[model samples]
Target: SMLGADVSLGQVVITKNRNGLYYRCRVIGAASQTCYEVNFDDGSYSDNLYPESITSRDCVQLGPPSEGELVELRWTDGNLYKAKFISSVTSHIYQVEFEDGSQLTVKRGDIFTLEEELPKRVRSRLSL
Candidate 1:
C-alpha cells in the first residue's frame, strides 16, 4: 500500500507545493488525480495533492537540541541555566525544562551544549 497510503482524516502531514515550499497540513478529504484535500496548519487549504507530495508530520529535518539532550539555555533576563531538551514547538524552537523543574520554550540559537556529558544518574534524576 505504498502508493495508496491511507492518510487518515485529521492526520498531520508535510506537503510540498509547486512553489517549492512545504507546510504542515491536516488531511480533510481525498480528491481525484491521486490527490488529497488538506487544511494547512498555517491557515491555508488546497485540493488535489499527490501522495508523493505529502509526508508525516514528525519529520523535522534538523537543528536544535533533541529530546533529553542536555543544554544550557539563555533566558530573557540574561541568565543561562542548565536544562534538558524536552520537545520542539517549531523549527529551531523547543520546550526545555530546567534543573529546578521549571520549563520554558526556547530557541535553538539561545542554547549551548556542555563540553562534558552529564552522568546517566543525574540525567535520569533531572528528567523526573
Candidate 2:
C-alpha cells in the first residue's frame, strides 16, 4: 500500500524528471502537495500561484475530498513552501504538479478545507 515511504517532515524529497532529479526537496506537509496555496494572500505578488482574492471571498468549496492536498518545505533561506495536490497519490504521498511541470509529494494530513472567508495575511512573504 505504501509506495516508498510516508515522507517525514524535513525529509529530502527529490524532483525527478526524464533527465534526472532536478531539485532536492525537504518534506513539510503530511500528504498534501500544495497546502501552501490555501494560505497565500489573494492580492500579493505570490497570488499568481494562488490567484484568488481573499477580499472577494470568491472561492469554490473544497469538498469532502478537498480540491487538493498539502506540502511544505523550509528552504535554505528559511522560507517555507506550502503546496496542494493536483493529482492523487497512487503510491504513498500525494503528488502535485506545478505550472512549471515540477512535482511535490504530500503526506496524508497536510490538507486544508479552508473556511469560506480567506485569511487576512499570508503567514510568510512569498518571493521568487
Candidate 3:
C-alpha cells in the first residue's frame, strides 16, 4: 500500500531513528498503536514509534522539503491530505496551500513528497 496504512508483519518500513533521521527497518512486533518494535538488522533498534512517522518506500522522504513541491500533509483533522508546498518559514516548518486554497504552517515530519504519477481530478477554487 503506497500511502496506505496496511503495515503488516515482515513489512520493511522507513522510520526516523533516535538521531532524528530516516532509517530502513522492519516491523518486529506491535505492542502499542504507536509503538512498533523495529530493528534495522544492523545493531540498531527501536521499541517505540509513532505510526505517522513510519512510512513505506515510496513515501520515504529525506532532508527538508522545498516550495512548489507536491507533498502529503498531515492535516489537523488527523488525516493525510495532498497539498502543494508553499514555503518554509523556519527549519522544517512549512507553509502549504491545500487543494481547498487554504494555507498553513506545518512540520516537516508531518509532510511527505508525492510519489508516482499525479492523481486524476483537478478543481481550483477562488482565493489563490
Candidate 4:
C-alpha cells in the first residue's frame, strides 16, 4: 500500500539511444537530512540503495556560500526546487530530500536552476 505522497522517481527513457537499456528508481526511505534509501530496477530484480557510501560537497565546500544551493528541477508537469548537495552519495548523484519532506534520488540532469546567490566561478560561468 502506498503511503503519504506518491513520491516520483526519475526514469531514464530511450529517446534516441536505442541500446535496449533503461533504468527507473524510487525512494524507499529517508534516514535524515543527509541520508536515505532508494529502490530501483533496470529490467532486473529490486535492490536496496542503502548504506550509501557516496560522498560529495556541502554547498559550502564548493565555495564560501551563505545559503543552500538552489536548483530548479524539471518534472513531467512542472518544476521542483532542490537543495543541491547539502549532502550527497556521489559527485554527480544526490540524496534529494524534497521541500515536501519526501526523499528522492537525482542526477545532474535533474537540475534546472541555481539559487540567485552562487560562487563567483559558477556565477561567471552562468553569466549571472
Tell me the TM-score of each prediction against the true structure.
0.23, 0.22, 0.23, 0.20
lDDT of 3 at 82: 47
Report the C-alpha lDDT of model 4 over 11-128, residue by residue, as the tens digit. 2211111222222223333222223222212223112222222223233345322224333232234533232323233223434443235444544344333232444543334320
Global lDDT of model 4:
0.30
TM-score quality measure for candidate 1:
0.23
Q: Model 3: how far is 84 from its true place, Å? A: 0.5
lDDT of 2 by residue, 92-114 (tens): 46454433555565444442222
lDDT tens digits, residue span 20-51, model 3: 44334444432222233343424564444333
- Number of the candidate with higher lDDT, 3 or 4: 3
Q: Please give the TM-score that candidate 4 achieves against the real structure.
A: 0.20
Whose TM-score is higher: candidate 3's or candidate 4's?
Answer: 3
Candidate 1 — number of clashing residue pairs? Answer: 0
C-alpha root-mean-square deviation, candidate 3: 22.4
Quote the lDDT for 41 in model 3: 28
> Model 2, residue 31: what's the lDDT?
39
Q: Where does candidate 4 stray beyond 4 Å?
A: 1-91, 115-128
Off by over 4 Å in 3: 1-61, 91-128
